[PDB]
Design a protein around this ligand. Structure first.
Ligand SMILES: *P(=O)(O)OCC(C)(C)[C@@H](O)C(=O)NCCC(=O)NCCSC(=O)CCCCCCCCC
Lengths: 559, 84, 58, 145, 275
């Protein structure tokens, strides 16, 4: 009674393949080549409160107000924000306030951008159950730099301030940008000091980001100018911005600010035959700067990025959030495979040389949200708890709403909202895979063989890969789960458990798994996985007598 | 304040019995380290320092060179006010 | 006794058992092998060790 | 041969077979999961290809023991037909055209092999038993089967 | 207090759309979060990435410097010292002029200003190597600080291993403990099955068997060896040369062949001070 369990047991049955005995119609075939069509477009009534505002009865619609004049708390808040009463300047730290007039207010409901692709239920949840609910934009407080601009620049698009005309308590909603729905508008009290502190948090974060990375960004700017001069390319402002966003690829890994901020959390974005599409989706996100700190083009057909059982590793990219200056560390893992290579490559090549259908690839992508300790930048714990209870996600109580909405928008635009999950979702998927392994499995195209293996993924391989994913997601009981799952595991599942223990960092458990593994190609590859002294240190459980002596590797592989 | 000689004798007897050189049955409550037990003077220092390990009190060098028998060790701890 | 007590007072990483064994071996075999003048030299050097914290034995 | 059987080229195996390895009539395969062969995938392919019926003979009957996987699933969240050999042969061999047979013989050291066969095999497997020879020796049991 | 509006006031409007009850979800949302504890700026790490809480002295302990001396002077003590020094008496060293000049330089403290070296090792690394060897079950671990003495290393560790296999295992474990800052690995083939030498910065590690350890006796040597004294160069030079009467006018003749290793270790400075 689960969607993922149903997808495991009964597949989609897309493409049929006829034979002399059966018809294998359930195969995860690679999508056809994409085609760009110029004919296909890219984009793809006034309410009562607004009418009363137009007629002049907005203060009458206001509940806590007089039938003629604005509310007392609202008038006091406007006076304080206009005269800086209660609490050559730096524009990054300074918090302006542009109060609008009654004829200048913007009364109406939240209108999603023309490119915002959300379902009806998702738009309802982002509008908090009422899409027709209208707000009154009256002032703009703080500006953030443009997406395409250098991340260390002054703000140009100001954040908006709304007030719900009909509410019981004084609430001011702070919207960072048009891409943030009212479900993530920061609800602050009617206190001018509260608004000032909420905006000063973002101001201080922007000032810190500038002071930390402006010199590096300007050095990259100079490098881009010099490289344009060398390559004889046109030298303009947009050209330099594009070349900086490109050299984000050539940026080195050692000098990347991956651990710039204290707190961090992990999320699983699903498995992709071509994770470059998801990477392009992340690159084209309105809530992230177009010039990332580091970019890695995942090309599975490159000799250094071919996914193997002891694969090349992890392709890493680092993006910066525009409004909260948090970090998104995208990690494409090319080493999660638990399938052994063919014993004779010539036969496998003869078998798959002329085949016009290739199976899907299961390549995991993770994202690490890195953020600093904040008290008023995440909108309090209640905002994120509401977001979690609404969208079935597992976010921390202090993760910035900017990064939260960035991840949500990216996953929804890519179409993997079901694949986007955390530790709880990964545990549920692991339970589903255990149930699927208990159930009988359907027949694939042809049975696997050490000589000619089957490229299609089986339930045991999926279970091993998901054990690896649960270890990667920093599960606190990952070692206990591996210990409980090892006695009832197959060979690919034990390989996945070894990789998962190695990822979690339990060298003793890894050595136990390697010593319990019976001798074979699986044991050889799980020994080759790590940097070791001698293979016997991992393979031999009991010390093998060598020259009337006994070696001991427990101190070498403990902790 | 002053510990009874019975409890002080039980501790020092357990040390000399569990010692690396003194045999179990060879020890007696009235014995000498060098003559009755057959130890050297360098071993007398070790059995004295072993007693100072269980009795937190610190013995000066002059008072330590006087303890050459188990009877002297019991009487010293008895009169010592630092007998824990 | 001074050497043994000083070692057990300030002997952090070095094995106290091994230190006592080394001191016993010295006092028991090295002096009995060498001459009396070298015995006195060893006595003076042991006093120097007691006064200078075992000569750097950490 | 599956599930960690003794090596086919062991000296005792050779002495007991006496040339059964050098023949060409009956092919003998070794499906080792640690090398990349999916034993049950291959067996289900054989079943669906040749339209066989799976029977299984365990030297020892399965014991009433729970599976750790159920408790593991609960932590992460928060029927075999027994038929005697004689009457089975009677009911399945008297008809004109009978399906081929896939016989899985094994000694149950852990007493769960029948359950795991039924779980990992489609076309629910039949359990072959001996009425008066219930608890017998593995050699004579396998010979009769 | 919080600057944001009532979380319950927001949940009241959210529950009409959520239609669910969320309870005890903060723990399940936090169990995946990682918090990094901050580190003080003043806290520095050793060569093995270990915090340091014990300070040291940049000068030598054997020094005699007025700046190092912390005891307050006294007029009566100065008068007594002057009345004592009123009687001229030369120093026991050979070169009287050189001995007086060296003592003056020592009490002035310019020797320490010239020999100031902040590249000293740390006892935290010695303790870490000790713990690694204890895990490897290496018997009789003996560490000696020879920074004050004439040597090339600050700390010398000595361990007893039983067999070439155990020796190589302990060497590889010390290497992997030093993996953070090491630049090379140990020799793969053992050229000596009874002795292994692992350099860790200014800390050296010797892994020997019982026989070779008792034969070398390096720990007793480095313990008996006195600390460096600048007055030692005031002694007479020594050089092995047979004269017509086995006596040098400005040099000394001492033969260490008739002396054992322990005799040499105990009398090296004694003979130089005597003759
Ligand atoms: P007791 O009377 O039974 O025995 C007393 C001793 C001194 C043990 C004699 O029996 C004895 O053995 N005498 C041998 C000759 C002698 O007097 N030896 C005196 C010892 S010399 C000395 O003091 C050595 C100190 C050197 C410092 C050793 C430190 C080593 C650090 C590694």
């Amino acid at each position: 009674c689960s969607p993922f369990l149903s997808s495991l047991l009964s597949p989609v049955e897309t493409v049929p393949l006829h034979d002399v005995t059966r018809t294998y119609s359930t195969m995860d075939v690679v999508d056809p080549p994409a085609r760009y069509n110029p004919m296909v477009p890219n984009v793809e009534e006034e309410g009562p409160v607004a009418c009363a505002h137009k007629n002049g009865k907005l203060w009458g619609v206001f509940e806590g107000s007089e039938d003629n004049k604005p509310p007392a708390w609202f008038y006091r808040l406007c006076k304080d924000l206009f005269y800086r009463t209660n609490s050559g300047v730096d524009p990054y730290v300074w918090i302006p306030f542009n109060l609008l007039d009654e004829a200048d207010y913007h009364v109406g409901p939240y209108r999603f951008p023309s490119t915002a692709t959300y379902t009806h239920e998702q738009r309802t949840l982002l509008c908090l159950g009422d899409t027709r609910r209208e707000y009154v934009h009256f002032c703009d407080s703080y500006a953030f730099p443009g997406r395409a601009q250098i991340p260390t620049s002054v703000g140009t698009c100001p954040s908006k301030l709304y007030v719900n005309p009909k509410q019981q308590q004084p609430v001011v909603y702070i919207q960072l940008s048009n891409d943030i729905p009212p479900a993530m508008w920061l609800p602050v009290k009617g206190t001018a000091a509260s608004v000032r502190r909420v905006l000063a948090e973002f101001a201080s974060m922007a000032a810190l980001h500038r002071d930390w990375h402006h010199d590096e960004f300007m050095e990259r700017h100079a490098t881009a100018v010099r490289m344009l001069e060398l390559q004889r390319l046109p030298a303009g402002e947009g050209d330099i911005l594009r070349y900086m966003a490109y050299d984000a690829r050539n940026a080195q890994f050692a000098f990347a600010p991956i651990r710039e901020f204290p707190n961090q959390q992990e999320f699983f974005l699903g498995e992709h035959d071509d994770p470059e599409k998801l990477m392009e989706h992340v690159d084209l996100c309105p809530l992230l700067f177009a010039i990332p700190h580091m970019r890695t083009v995942v090309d599975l057909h490159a000799e250094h990025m071919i996914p193997t059982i002891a694969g090349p590793g992890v392709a890493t990219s680092l993006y910066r959030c525009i409004y909260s200056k948090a970090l998104l560390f995208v990690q494409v893992h090319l080493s999660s495979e638990v399938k052994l290579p063919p014993q004779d490559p010539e036969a496998f090549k003869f078998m798959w040389k002329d085949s016009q259908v290739l199976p899907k690839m299961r390549i995991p992508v993770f994202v690490r949200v890195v953020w600093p300790t904040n008290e008023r930048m995440s909108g309090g714990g209640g905002l994120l708890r509401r977001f979690n209870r609404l969208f079935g996600t597992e976010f921390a109580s202090d993760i910035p709403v900017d990064a939260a909405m960035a991840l949500l928008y990216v996953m929804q635009w890519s179409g993997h909202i079901k694949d986007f999950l955390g530790v709880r979702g990964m545990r549920q998927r692991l339970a589903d895979l255990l149930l699927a392994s208990q159930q009988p499995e359907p027949t694939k195209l042809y049975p696997g063989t050490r000589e000619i293996p089957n490229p299609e993924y089986t339930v045991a391989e999926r279970l091993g890969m998901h054990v690896q994913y649960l270890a990667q997601l920093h599960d606190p009981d990952i070692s206990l789960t591996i210990q409980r799952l090892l006695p009832v595991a197959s060979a690919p599942v034990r390989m996945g458990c070894a990789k998962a223990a190695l990822i979690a960092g339990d060298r003793e458990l890894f050595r136990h798994i390697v010593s319990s593994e019976p001798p074979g190609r699986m044991q050889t590859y799980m020994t080759k996985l790590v940097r070791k002294r001698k293979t016997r240190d991992l393979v031999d459980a009991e010390p093998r007598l060598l020259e009337d002596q006994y070696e001991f590797a427990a101190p070498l592989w403990t902790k | 304040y002053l510990l009874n000689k019975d409890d002080v004798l039980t501790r020092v007897l357990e040390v000399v019995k569990n010692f690396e050189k003194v045999d179990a049955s060879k020890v007696t409550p009235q014995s000498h380290f060098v003559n009755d037990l057959g130890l050297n003077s360098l071993d007398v220092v070790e059995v004295v320092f072993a007693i100072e390990q269980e009795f937190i009190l610190d013995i000066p060098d002059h008072d330590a060179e006087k303890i050459q028998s188990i009877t002297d060790a019991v009487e010293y701890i008895s009169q010592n006010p630092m007998a824990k | 006794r001074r050497l043994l007590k000083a070692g057990h007072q300030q002997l952090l990483v070095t094995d106290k058992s091994y230190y006592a064994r080394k001191v016993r071996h010295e006092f028991e075999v090295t002096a009995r092998q060498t001459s009396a003048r070298v015995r006195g030299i060893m006595y003076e050097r042991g006093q120097w060790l007691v006064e200078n914290k075992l000569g750097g034995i950490v | 041969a599956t599930n960690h059987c003794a090596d086919l080229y062991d000296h005792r195996v050779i002495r007991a077979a006496r040339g059964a390895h050098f023949q060409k009539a009956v092919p003998i395969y070794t499906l080792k999961e640690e090398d990349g062969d999916n034993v049950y995938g291959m067996l289900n392919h054989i079943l669906q290809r040749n339209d066989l019926s799976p029977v299984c003979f365990a030297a020892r009957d399965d014991n009433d023991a729970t599976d750790e996987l159920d408790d593991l699933v609960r932590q992460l969240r928060s029927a075999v037909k027994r038929e005697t050999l004689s009457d089975y042969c009677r009911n399945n061999f008297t008809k004109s055209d009978a399906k081929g047979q896939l016989l899985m013989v094994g000694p149950n050291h852990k007493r769960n092999s029948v359950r795991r066969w039924s779980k990992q095999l489609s076309i629910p497997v039949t359990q072959l038993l001996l009425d008066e020879v219930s608890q017998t020796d593995a050699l004579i049991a396998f010979s009769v089967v | 207090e919080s600057d944001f509006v009532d979380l319950q006031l927001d949940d009241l409007t959210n529950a009409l759309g959520s239609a669910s009850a969320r309870r005890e979800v903060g723990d399940s949302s936090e169990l995946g979060v990682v918090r990094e504890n901050d580190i003080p700026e003043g806290q520095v790490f050793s060569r093995l990435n270990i915090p340091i809480s014990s300070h040291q002295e940049e000068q030598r302990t054997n020094s005699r410097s007025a700046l190092r001396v912390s005891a307050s002077d006294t007029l009566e003590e100065t008068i007594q010292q002057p009345t004592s020094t009123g009687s001229k008496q030369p120093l026991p060293y050979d070169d009287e002029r050189f001995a007086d000049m060296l003592l003056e330089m020592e009490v002035e403290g310019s020797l320490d200003e010239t020999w100031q070296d902040g590249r000293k090792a740390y006892i935290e690394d010695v303790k870490e190597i000790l713990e690694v060897l204890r895990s490897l079950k290496v018997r009789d671990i003996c560490a000696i600080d020879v920074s004050n003495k004439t040597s090339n290393f600050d700390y010398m560790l000595f361990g007893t291993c039983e067999g070439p296999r155990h020796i190589h295992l302990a060497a590889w474990a010390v290497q992997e403990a030093d993996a953070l800052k090491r630049v090379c690995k140990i020799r793969r083939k053992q050229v000596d099955h009874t002795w292994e030498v692992v350099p860790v910065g200014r800390i050296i590690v010797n892994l020997m068997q019982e026989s070779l350890r008792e034969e070398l006796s390096l720990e007793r040597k480095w313990a008996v060896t006195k600390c460096m004294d600048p007055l030692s160069v005031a002694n007479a030079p020594v050089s092995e040369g047979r004269s017509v009467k086995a006596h040098g006018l400005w040099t000394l003749t001492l033969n260490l062949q008739d002396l054992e290793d322990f005799e040499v270790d105990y009398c090296k400075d004694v003979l130089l001070t005597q003759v």
